[PDB]
Paper text:
The protein [name] (encoded by the [name] gene [C1_08500C_A]) plays a crucial role in the survival, pathogenicity, and antifungal drug susceptibilities of [name]. First, [name] has enolase activity and plays an essential role in glycolysis (catalyzing the conversion of 2-phospho-d-glycerate [2-PG] to phosphoenolpyruvate) in [name], as knocking out the [name] gene renders [name] inviable on media with glucose as the sole carbon source. Second, [name] has transglutaminase activity and an ability to bind host plasminogen (PLG) and thus plays a key role in the invasion and virulence of [name]. Enolase is a dimeric enzyme and is critical for glycolysis, where it catalyzes the conversion of 2-PG to phosphoenolpyruvate.
To investigate the mechanism of action, we solved the crystal structure of [name] [name](CaEno1) and then compared the difference between this structure and that of [name] from humans. The diffraction data show that in an asymmetric unit, four [name] proteins form two dimers. The interface formed by the two dimers is through four pairs of hydrogen bonds, as follows: K80 in the B chain and E285 and R314 in the D chain form two hydrogen bonds, D72 in the B chain and Q286 in the D chain form one hydrogen bond, and S425 in the B chain forms one hydrogen bond with K202 in the D chain. Two CaEno1 molecules form a homodimer face-to-face in an antiparallel manner. In this dimer structure, the β1 to β3 strand plus the α5 helix and α16 helix of each [name] form an interaction interface. The β1 to β3 strand is exposed to the protein surface, and the rest of the β strands are embedded in the interior of [name]. Interestingly the β4 to β13 strand forms a large β-barrel, while the α helices of the C-terminal domain are wrapped in the β-barrel to form a mixed α/β-barrel. This structure is similar to the three-dimensional structure of [name] in other species, suggesting that the active site of CaEno1 may also be in the C-terminal domain. We compared the sequence and structure of CaEno1 with S. cerevisiae [name] and hEno1. The consistency of amino acid sequences of CaEno1 versus S. cerevisiae [name] and CaEno1 versus hEno1 were 76.66% and 61.98%, respectively.
Residue numbers in the entry:
A (entry chain B): 3 to 40, 44 to 440
B (entry chain A): 2 to 440
The structure:
């Protein structure tokens, strides 16, 4: 099926090189771009030549595709519709467990481009191919709740605020079109309120499109967002999600909510139980629907205890905890540490393994939030992935840079194409695969 | 081949506001174009039609323009069965449907999407890349294709970024290398060095970006921004190989016949507002102090006397680019040519609204010995048309953002693909950017 496979480098949304693959069949040319990657994830290959792109070149990974993968896969004459055989072959070219000989970024571009070639071979949209090969439940397609970054903290902002991301989730409407419109309106009201309260510069955006004013406390951030939802006119219709990224402030088995302060008073660092009390207070006060990485990546007991406290009424999402890694995912399921997975395809390195991880999550009753990376591209693959996997949830940025909006625009085209055969996940996003 | 189906929808641009996207189907398949949108439009631009319904998208919906495509333009054009390779006949038909000089009946943002999609369908019908079709219909000189110098807006100010900085865009222009690929690599390395230097001098928040991907420090003088960029070039290792360009967008602070360099300060004192002559003297100092190769909109969009005076002083030393002055409009370019007000056109297809009129604007400029810089808007999309346009027109110059947000990199990535496709058949404009159409 594959008659020509060619890779090149292009630039990602932060100005760093990444791998793009042209995958040619008799049905035409199909292109994928790998987002930015990285002990638990598959390893992206960077060149390390400090004199070019500050060591971030990907000419070696590009060459691994053109010089090793392309002639091997072409010679194998594998039907691109058989995604599992394509990926099984890809993995046979690299014997390391983390794809470190060829590069996760070299392997993944080929995996994804073949999926695009296969959809066209069958005359179906990519999300329908993905629904087929992941064995999604038949019925109406489910369009995802966009979990939209609006406000950034932690490592991404000055001021004391320790939590890394605050997102809006427009769940209280009946269509994805309305959800995205309300999301854009709330985001614009938040930018306006941010500039007035924190100054004009505070309205300049970070890597994922959100703002990063100098905020002190979680309550201040959450109040700001609540103010934007109300001023935009959608009080009661917009949930809030947090990505705490608490590994960044885990110290001596406690949690330093002033970790950016070099004088941080250690007598105020919170135990596991005290941080759970704090989250439970915030849950009592705000329409928080999902919390990502509330406890540190290896603080397993803290996750399990917290999940028994709040797990039946809020989504708890592993990111640093699970790293789209089968062994870690199986651990978290068996421990009952969480009930939802961030799915980063370039953390695992092939589409088949990604679909496996998503299906193992669904089988445990977990949710799946298909996720962007900080270094994104104009590629829209994860939009079709979230629809095809029936995840009902996607995390792909603020509504404010086109490597973010390109995914959301693609779901707009999917929604229009499907018409009455699609359903917006709305408040049912946690269990959307079962709708 | 001719259109079999034409369908429009709204999508979201890089600022989160709706814009128009057109699906143009022929026997060769479906061709998609997306209309960009400026955050600060010149008063003479063709009309961008917005709905003004304040209960939806804060009045910035484009449902009317989308319905104008679906309900007026699409059935009429499909009926006419116009050969898509005949771009002028396509655009003449579109223009007849609207019948107004500024496209205010249907909206330039309903017309342009169809115009651009037609040209993509035309390239497919002929089995050639878009940039080659554009070279053909623009009657570009035959020979090597010319790849453009990427003018990268690495420090944002004015209406594109919160903070005190009056001038809208400070760009680097990596002219002192031999290939487009090297120019892009150097551009990214200078940008990353600039971001590091900016955060260490102005704080972490100053590394956040404006609309076009440039860093946005809260600085007050052009000298501060230019020193920062010079330091970034030097520390990256490319001293002497990178020119600087500015887009002043001076119409944004032209008030009472003077120029307010503190215009985002609501308490800006009118005593410090500069006259035309005072502003020209500041440019002359900056041109001497820094390797500035191009200045865009140095004076306001109808302040003809000041443009003429400034051109007399430095028109032989630097490129002087009309943007709001000319709005990619042949009638205003004629005035600028005859008055000797500038020597380059900023080509923004959506300021005039059809490809054919945009190409006429470029060819009128070339005929006067002017340069042409093909340009994005600050509200951009994943669309990559202007990459091929800059190559096809042989402009040697493109302005499509900093190497940061992907509505900017998408265009530069597309030029990387064109470069690789062309191989020895392409030349990098390099230091010859100003007269690249004659190379």
């Amino acid at each position: 099926y594959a008659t020509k496979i060619h890779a090149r480098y292009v630039y990602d949304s932060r100005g760093n090189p990444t791998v793009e693959v042209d995958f040619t069949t008799d049905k035409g040319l199909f292109r994928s771009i790998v987002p930015s990657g990285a002990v638990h994830e598959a390893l992206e290959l960077r060149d390390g030549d400090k004199s070019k792109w500050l060591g971030k070149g990907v000419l070696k990974a590009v060459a691994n595709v053109n010089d090793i993968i392309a002639p091997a896969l072409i010679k194998a004459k594998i039907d691109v519709v058989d995604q599992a055989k394509i990926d099984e072959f890809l993995l046979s070219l690299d014997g390391t467990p983390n794809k470190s000989k060829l590069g996760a970024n070299a392997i993944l571009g080929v995996s994804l481009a073949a999926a695009n070639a296969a959809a066209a071979a069958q005359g179906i949209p990519l999300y329908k191919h993905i629904a087929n090969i992941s064995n999604a439940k038949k019925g109406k397609f489910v369009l995802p709740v966009p979990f939209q970054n609006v406000l950034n903290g932690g490592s991404h902002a000055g001021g004391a605020l320790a939590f890394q991301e605050f997102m809006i989730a427009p769940t209280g409407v009946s269509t994805f079109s309305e959800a995205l419109r309300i999301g854009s309106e709330v985001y614009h009201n938040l930018k306006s309120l941010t500039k007035k309260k924190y100054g004009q510069s505070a309205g300049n955006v970070g890597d994922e499109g959100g703002v990063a004013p100098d905020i002190k406390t979680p309550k201040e951030a959450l109040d700001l967002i609540m103010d934007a939802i109300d001023k935009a006119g959608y009080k009661g219709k917009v949930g809030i999600a947090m990505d705490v990224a608490s590994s960044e402030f885990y110290k001596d088995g406690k949690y330093d909510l002033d970790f950016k302060n070099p004088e941080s008073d250690p007598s105020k660092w919170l135990s596991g139980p005290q941080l759970a009390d704090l989250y439970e207070q915030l849950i009592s006060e705000y329409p928080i629907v999902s919390i990502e990485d509330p406890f540190a990546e290896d603080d397993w007991d803290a996750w399990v205890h917290f999940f028994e406290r709040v797990g039946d009424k809020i989504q708890i999402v592993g990111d640093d905890l699970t790293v789209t890694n089968p062994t870690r995912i199986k651990t978290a399921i068996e421990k009952k540490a969480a009930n939802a997975l961030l799915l980063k395809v370039n953390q695992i390195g092939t589409l088949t393994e990604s679909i496996q991880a998503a299906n193992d999550s669904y089988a445990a009753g977990w949710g799946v939030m298909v996720s962007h990376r900080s270094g994104e591209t104009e590629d829209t693959f994860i939009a079709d992935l979230s629809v095809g996997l029936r995840s009902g949830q996607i995390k792909t940025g603020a509504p404010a840079r086109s490597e973010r909006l390109a995914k959301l625009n693609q779901i707009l085209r999917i929604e229009e194409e499907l018409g009455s055969e699609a359903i917006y996940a709305g408040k049912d996003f946690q269990k959307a695969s079962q709708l």
